[PDB]
Amino acid sequence: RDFNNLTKGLCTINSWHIYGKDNAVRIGEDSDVLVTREPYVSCDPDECRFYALSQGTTIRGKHSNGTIHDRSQYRALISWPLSSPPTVYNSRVECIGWSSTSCHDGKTRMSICISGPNNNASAVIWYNRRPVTEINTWARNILRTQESECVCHNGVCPVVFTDGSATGPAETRIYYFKEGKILKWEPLAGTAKHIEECSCYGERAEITCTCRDNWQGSNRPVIRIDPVAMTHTSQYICSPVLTDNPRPNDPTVGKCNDPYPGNNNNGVKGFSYLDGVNTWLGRTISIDSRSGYEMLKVPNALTDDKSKPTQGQTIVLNTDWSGYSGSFMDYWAEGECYRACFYVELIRGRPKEDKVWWTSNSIVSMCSSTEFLGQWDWPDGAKIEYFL
Amino acid sequence: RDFNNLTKGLCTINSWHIYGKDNAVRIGEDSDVLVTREPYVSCDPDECRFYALSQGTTIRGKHSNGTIHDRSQYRALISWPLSSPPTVYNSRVECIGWSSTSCHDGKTRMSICISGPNNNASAVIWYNRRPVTEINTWARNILRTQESECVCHNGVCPVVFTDGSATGPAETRIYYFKEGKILKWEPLAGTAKHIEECSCYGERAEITCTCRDNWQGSNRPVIRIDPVAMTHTSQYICSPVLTDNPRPNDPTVGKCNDPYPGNNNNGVKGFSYLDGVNTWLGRTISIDSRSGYEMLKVPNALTDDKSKPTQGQTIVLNTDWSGYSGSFMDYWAEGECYRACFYVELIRGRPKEDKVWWTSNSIVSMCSSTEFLGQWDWPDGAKIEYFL
Amino acid sequence: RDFNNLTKGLCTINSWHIYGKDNAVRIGEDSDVLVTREPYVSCDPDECRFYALSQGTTIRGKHSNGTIHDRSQYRALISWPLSSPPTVYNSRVECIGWSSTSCHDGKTRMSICISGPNNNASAVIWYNRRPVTEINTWARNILRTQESECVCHNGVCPVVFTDGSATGPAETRIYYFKEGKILKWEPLAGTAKHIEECSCYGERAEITCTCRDNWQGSNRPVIRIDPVAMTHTSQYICSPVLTDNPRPNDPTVGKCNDPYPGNNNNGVKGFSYLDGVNTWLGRTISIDSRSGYEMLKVPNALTDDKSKPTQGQTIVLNTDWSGYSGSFMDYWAEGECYRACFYVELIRGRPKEDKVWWTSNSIVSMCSSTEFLGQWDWPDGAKIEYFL
Amino acid sequence: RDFNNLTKGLCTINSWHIYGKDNAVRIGEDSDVLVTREPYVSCDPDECRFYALSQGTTIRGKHSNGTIHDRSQYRALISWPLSSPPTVYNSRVECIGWSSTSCHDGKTRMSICISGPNNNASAVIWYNRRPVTEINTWARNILRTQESECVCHNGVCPVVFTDGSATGPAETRIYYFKEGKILKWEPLAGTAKHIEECSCYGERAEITCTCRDNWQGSNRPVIRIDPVAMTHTSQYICSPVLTDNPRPNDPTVGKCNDPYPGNNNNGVKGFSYLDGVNTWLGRTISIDSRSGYEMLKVPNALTDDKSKPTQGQTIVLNTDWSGYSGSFMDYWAEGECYRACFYVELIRGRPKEDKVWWTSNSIVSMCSSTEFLGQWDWPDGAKIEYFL
Ligand SMILES: *[C@@H]1O[C@H](CO)[C@@H](O[C@@H]2O[C@H](CO)[C@@H](O[C@@H]3O[C@H](CO[C@H]4O[C@H](CO)[C@@H](O)[C@H](O)[C@@H]4O)[C@@H](O)[C@H](O[C@H]4O[C@H](CO)[C@@H](O)[C@H](O)[C@@H]4O[C@H]4O[C@H](CO)[C@@H](O)[C@H](O)[C@@H]4O[C@H]4O[C@H](CO)[C@@H](O)[C@H](O)[C@@H]4O)[C@@H]3O)[C@H](O)[C@H]2NC(C)=O)[C@H](O)[C@H]1NC(C)=O
Ligand SMILES: *[C@@H]1O[C@H](CO)[C@@H](O[C@@H]2O[C@H](CO)[C@@H](O[C@@H]3O[C@H](CO[C@H]4O[C@H](CO)[C@@H](O)[C@H](O)[C@@H]4O)[C@@H](O)[C@H](O[C@H]4O[C@H](CO)[C@@H](O)[C@H](O)[C@@H]4O[C@H]4O[C@H](CO)[C@@H](O)[C@H](O)[C@@H]4O[C@H]4O[C@H](CO)[C@@H](O)[C@H](O)[C@@H]4O)[C@@H]3O)[C@H](O)[C@H]2NC(C)=O)[C@H](O)[C@H]1NC(C)=O
Ligand SMILES: *[C@@H]1O[C@H](CO)[C@@H](O[C@@H]2O[C@H](CO)[C@@H](O[C@@H]3O[C@H](CO[C@H]4O[C@H](CO)[C@@H](O)[C@H](O)[C@@H]4O)[C@@H](O)[C@H](O[C@H]4O[C@H](CO)[C@@H](O)[C@H](O)[C@@H]4O[C@H]4O[C@H](CO)[C@@H](O)[C@H](O)[C@@H]4O[C@H]4O[C@H](CO)[C@@H](O)[C@H](O)[C@@H]4O)[C@@H]3O)[C@H](O)[C@H]2NC(C)=O)[C@H](O)[C@H]1NC(C)=O
Ligand SMILES: *[C@@H]1O[C@H](CO)[C@@H](O[C@@H]2O[C@H](CO)[C@@H](O[C@@H]3O[C@H](CO[C@H]4O[C@H](CO)[C@@H](O)[C@H](O)[C@@H]4O)[C@@H](O)[C@H](O[C@H]4O[C@H](CO)[C@@H](O)[C@H](O)[C@@H]4O[C@H]4O[C@H](CO)[C@@H](O)[C@H](O)[C@@H]4O[C@H]4O[C@H](CO)[C@@H](O)[C@H](O)[C@@H]4O)[C@@H]3O)[C@H](O)[C@H]2NC(C)=O)[C@H](O)[C@H]1NC(C)=O
Ligand SMILES: *[C@@H]1O[C@H](CO)[C@@H](O)[C@H](O)[C@H]1NC(C)=O
Ligand SMILES: *[C@@H]1O[C@H](CO)[C@@H](O)[C@H](O)[C@H]1NC(C)=O
Ligand SMILES: *[C@@H]1O[C@H](CO)[C@@H](O)[C@H](O)[C@H]1NC(C)=O
Ligand SMILES: *[C@@H]1O[C@H](CO)[C@@H](O)[C@H](O)[C@H]1NC(C)=O
């Protein structure tokens, strides 16, 4: 009932524990479950919820054929109860569009959807279930945003937007919103060459986003935002542990202010928790495809260009598919510190499972533990052959 | 918790932005979605909802065969959450009948359903979920009303009703209700010849309805109601930009107090926002059928008989079906002014898609923007061939 | 938040208007709708709801075969939102059993289910969602109760129970409950010979029940209960307009304290509103079967043995099936007087539609109007042939 | 809004009455009902709910094939409304795992799920919908817990956990939690040799659990916990009325501090209400398999090794399947004393109904009565042959 403020630091992450899992495509083989992709999680002061971009069809209905394509007029941002499947009967529609981000400021929720032709898109900013501000395309080539939650501090919620090429220079701007109104916006600054799909968190009055360079880095770019002064900077994560996909093998030394060369023009959304010695990175196991997922503790990843792993935990084995991953935390949980959390999208269907005509996914999510806990793997679990 | 009062004027409409879309018949190909028609939207102080007249069947159930017919004992007014499909499991029934209107007065909701044989129908007025007043047929030939929301000011909610022929003179009365009780009623006055299906809004303590002359105008009639003094007047929109369907081509000069001749005995429900220089009109693109939809800014449409378009925005392309359209606004949104909004029904099935035995529809809805935003088209999106 | 008291008299009933209709078996041809029978309606201070005894199956599931039988361990009292179908996903279970009654006292709800073998049944009295009192069989042959709502006055809610033969003398007791505890009980008194299935209402601190004599009256028995003094009396409705089914034709003179002879050992549950000149009776049109339904104004029916109809209204035409009917009113509606209401069960399936293996029903319900409104007929509306 | 305290003693149990029944597999033959096992019931201050471990599939979906296996990554603790089926659309997920226990302390709910490989499992303790404490495996062979509700007194909720062999000595610890944090833990003490699956209740500031010795007793072990002093003791129920399954026939004398020999290495979860002369025991009728269920009053069962039955009540007949059974009570019900209650799992599918490829169950539950009520039997009621 007053605005949240990032007062705490992160707890120490000694391992990760299961937080949510919806088993969507299993249950979707015989229930009215919606086809989705681009998932995230976001909390409110009294409940956390699962989020995604619908495709306007059930998995087993005939309009599922073709849902590999990303933008169209039938997609919408939807949220459902934690660890339930996105079902026709139990989902809330937030706004209409094919790209999105959402966060609670402590009083109410802000949600952003973007819709349009490639060359004439727009974003409209919803605050307390109502349309309030609208922005139109500035560079005229797919105005897109985070695909996971934003973070607010005392009313200001910064969002990163990118408009222009995915294959060369683009135009990225950080917008600072308070109650749906634009307070100010800046263009991208610092040394990062290209920004797409930022995964963000906040602690001790500072916001950290780990993003996706699609043009040329296999190492990830980092934007650090100050919500009071409303300024930002960018860098790349120095560590030679590379974390985009596809990517070349890991080198011995890495790069702090330049992209690491090797693959060009493709990527995946990812995250990291950058906190000195208490720094963990997530990545696909495969260097060629989005398959397998693992967490690795690389002390001082951001600042040391020779930093190797000290500890790890496998989340999805290499034989199963992963997809986008992103950060969230529950800033309304009781405690001295913020507990870190993430999610991994588990895509099933096309492109890799060519025997079906659709593309959908489930979620698995995880939070930290100060305890050193044993691990298990968390695969989607459907058998594609039942859908034939 | 006290009655709403129309205190504000309209914002300036420089373009329109997507507000809601339910993709009902797509999802209805494999979910328990109800067959409907005659949709509208209506807000409460804390949520806006989608509304329609059910047919008492799912799209894919066998009693869908025959739902082209308009009146029967299995239809009911239902409402569901914004941008969800009218599903068996998620709909609230408001009252039983085949014609309806509904509005919130700031304390609670008033809903009107009408049921009967053609020659012996009645309306019962529900207020705060209970039956309170009942009116019986006066001219004995299909007592019908708005098919979209009414508007209240300090407790008085005027509704327009028509009883009698659709093909010659009829008997139309404006009723003023306060808390479900009739304060007064008048017969239609001014110069409009025939009234059917009024789409209404209010601003600065005045209510404007744009209606449908079914007997002989291709230009639309306008009733202006004063909720304090409880009086009204009618006219036609002077502009030569004609907006009923079917209609002849646009002339050079139009008609303020007479119907424009050309087509006879048929029409569609429509709306306009009549606000001096800030006047927008909606219409089908086809002059022969309900296909395509577009918004056009015609400054001073109501009062100037030579007024041509200054700006426009295509909402549905000509190759896709449209249907009824109607006004709504959210009089409980924060702001200095009322933001204008509308919806378009997108009918699928019979008469035009003769290969199926049913008739159902989806909704797309839109609100204003002071920004000049790019456009996209918003078609239903189902493929009829999947239902064969 | 304090106990309701029957302060008002009835309004004048000049005609009846549609109140609720769920179209259950139509929508049940392709939705997860439960098989039911024995329906009623009952209001709470803030919403009215539909009630019935489930059979533990959907209409289209295979355990529907056999649901003609009345008692078994898979039946339960369930309630759902007004004018919705009894669906798997939207129903609340109240208590487990094959006979039931329920009423709100103004603070919370009392519900009674009965379960057992024929010779060893029991009733348990639920108050504010919890078990509180239990009664066991006294005459050891199907302990049964109202199958529609009870009525409370200042905390006392009388219920009529019958244990013993349906084909000769039985043992009927009126129990007076306050907050789930038994204050007192009496055996049946006055002149009525046999009591089954009472339909009750209250006005001006008195409760009236019209019941079913199954042994030998084609005229109905009436119990009048005083909730303060906790006493009762019985009589039969004097009028020669006979209202049980099956029944012989109407005579010229009727019987006040004896059953009218003609048919023996069978009946249907029914009701009447007995209020001097403002007295209305409901009945099947067919004298042989539960088909058609109509309301008839017979002034002074209770007390005059030569009273003929003055006005009427057809509710269901003779060509369609009806079933049980029962009274309810909304004692929390605003007004100077209690508005009368009823429901009719519309049974479909066996015995009469022998081509299917199941038995289920829908509801239509109606309330009074001081206006003289036109009528329509309200049939179930499913086509049995779609279920083959 | 303050912590519950066990202030009352038990009421006298003179018979048992139906409390809840969900008929899940009947309705599951044609609805989206989840496959489950290991059920229980647990109350909150304002509603009681049904609980179970999901398998991540509907009964009629193809991933039902194989659900006989107990642990996997697709299981979760779920709760639904009392006497409804575990449906996709109406279930709340509590935490992810294949073993669980849950209880309300009067302020909010505590829930524990366990997940892992056999040799590397962990438990995470949820309090007020959030992760708070995590424990890791101590003996490295299936860390498991109660499979029914825990009981709190003034904030302390003791839970029994077992880690190690089911076929020899294991390592069992009683943990005392207050608001999700561990106050203290002890290892098992007293004379019981092996503990698995405790069914617990509390009265007059003491908690009683009746558990399962899997290694070698056909008589059940009892742990008595003091929540203030945080200590416990164990014994076996002296009575010669044996209550595990499988078991040898009943002897003439039984054993208070040693297991009764006869069967080795297998069992079922069960309960008892141990209250001097007012002591009731539940058991399967079959000595070879989980089929039939009955309640028997054996005065002083715990303390007398020659105690025979005085009264009984059959709950499920021998020809039908039963499964796990467990205690619950509603410590927020109005009254002078705690009313005792239990549930029985009714397993259908494999191992015994080998003609289907799945394993699922329904619930029947019961509470006490001071009245001597007649009995009925409460079987699952599905016909397996409809699933072929
Ligand atoms: C019970 O549960 C517990 C708790 O989970 C289990 O204990 C955990 O076990 C894990 C598996 O052993 C272990 O995870 C590994 O940790 C290593 C860290 O240990 C090192 O440092 C510590 C401290 O100094 C020492 O104790 C230890 O000896 C080691 O020195 C990581 O090194 C591991 O990650 C690497 O291996 C995996 C595959 O095994 C790779 O997928 C991963 O990417 C890492 O390896 C690649 O990357 C590094 C860094 O660049 C390269 O140098 C290396 O060559 C690899 O490079 C190739 O591969 C990548 C991807 O394929 C590619 O991109 C690149 O180009 C190359 O091709 C791993 O994280 C946990 O730390 C441990 N936890 C605890 C608390 O102990 C226990 O086993 C369970 N079971 C039982 C029975 O108890
Ligand atoms: C990115 O997004 C932006 C934002 O949406 C896009 O920009 C918009 O582009 C629209 C399409 O060009 C444009 O809409 C048109 O606007 C015209 C208004 O412009 C005129 O006035 C302004 C100011 O003076 C001038 O700048 C301009 O030069 C023009 O003079 C309207 O005239 C257009 O409507 C008419 O055309 C459409 C078909 O194109 C018809 O369907 C419509 O009914 C109108 O035409 C009929 O009616 C008129 C009036 O009677 C007749 O005179 C005419 O002959 C037509 O009559 C026949 O047709 C009707 C129906 O079929 C029939 O009933 C009748 O009998 C006849 O048969 C149209 O509204 C937007 O204004 C513009 N917005 C902005 C902010 O700039 C941009 O393109 C996007 N794309 C890219 C790559 O950026
Ligand atoms: C528009 O809507 C309006 C509003 O609804 C419509 O107006 C209504 O029209 C109804 C149909 O005409 C009418 O209902 C009838 O009312 C009669 C009452 O009228 C009499 O009294 C008044 C006042 O004195 C006079 O004005 C009038 O002239 C009459 O004298 C009832 O008599 C009618 O009920 C009887 O007929 C129906 C069949 O038509 C039977 O089913 C019913 O059971 C009644 O008849 C049986 O029972 C009586 C009494 O015992 C017997 O005497 C008789 O012989 C019948 O007995 C056989 O049948 C029963 C059952 O089958 C069986 O058990 C028995 O043994 C025998 O076999 C009927 O109720 C409304 O009153 C009228 N309302 C108003 C406000 O005016 C209007 O039509 C609509 N349409 C249009 C175009 O406007
Ligand atoms: C209407 O409803 C009412 C209310 O429910 C019905 O009344 C109830 O009727 C029940 C059935 O008769 C009755 O239940 C039985 O109660 C016996 C207690 O009675 C004895 O003591 C009282 C007081 O002294 C006396 O009045 C009476 O004469 C008796 O002496 C129990 O003994 C019964 O349980 C035993 O029988 C059943 C089968 O019938 C077994 O399944 C059960 O396990 C018990 O028997 C086994 O165990 C005992 C103890 O070890 C052995 O000694 C015995 O040999 C059996 O052992 C074999 O079987 C077990 C399991 O198969 C196996 O493990 C073992 O190794 C051996 O193989 C039973 O509980 C209720 O008490 C009575 N209630 C009331 C209030 O009166 C009424 O009938 C209904 N119907 C009508 C028409 O009214
Ligand atoms: C956040 O900080 C502002 C002042 O900077 C203060 O008013 C507000 O109460 C703080 N937030 C909360 C949740 O206390
Ligand atoms: C999917 O669509 C393509 C054309 O877009 C068609 O060839 C294909 O057969 C469809 N798949 C199925 C299962 O119908
Ligand atoms: C509407 O006007 C009346 C007096 O005309 C006033 O009492 C009421 O409070 C006004 N409405 C609101 C929402 O303030
Ligand atoms: C629809 O109904 C007509 C008769 O009303 C029948 O001829 C037609 O075949 C039906 N359509 C279907 C698909 O059964």
Ligand SMILES: *[C@@H]1O[C@H](CO)[C@@H](O)[C@H](O)[C@H]1NC(C)=O
């Ligand atoms: C009913 O009557 C009692 C006294 O007889 C009174 O306390 C109570 O308030 C009355 N009911 C209501 C709703 O006022």
Ligand SMILES: *[C@@H]1O[C@H](CO)[C@@H](O)[C@H](O)[C@H]1NC(C)=O
């Ligand atoms: C219903 O059950 C009977 C036996 O009880 C059986 O003969 C009949 O064929 C069943 N009906 C259907 C449709 O299976």
Ligand SMILES: *[C@@H]1O[C@H](CO)[C@@H](O)[C@H](O)[C@H]1NC(C)=O
């Ligand atoms: C439980 O006992 C504590 C003190 O031991 C007391 O504060 C608390 O209020 C008691 N519980 C309730 C529900 O009163």
Ligand SMILES: *[C@@H]1O[C@H](CO)[C@@H](O)[C@H](O)[C@H]1NC(C)=O
């Ligand atoms: C279940 O799975 C087994 C192999 O795990 C397979 O042989 C069997 O046929 C399956 N059952 C069904 C009905 O498909």
Ligand SMILES: [Ca+2]
């Ligand atoms: Ca890249």
Ligand SMILES: [Ca+2]
């Ligand atoms: Ca016209």
Ligand SMILES: [Ca+2]
């Ligand atoms: Ca009779």
Ligand SMILES: [Ca+2]
């Ligand atoms: Ca054992």
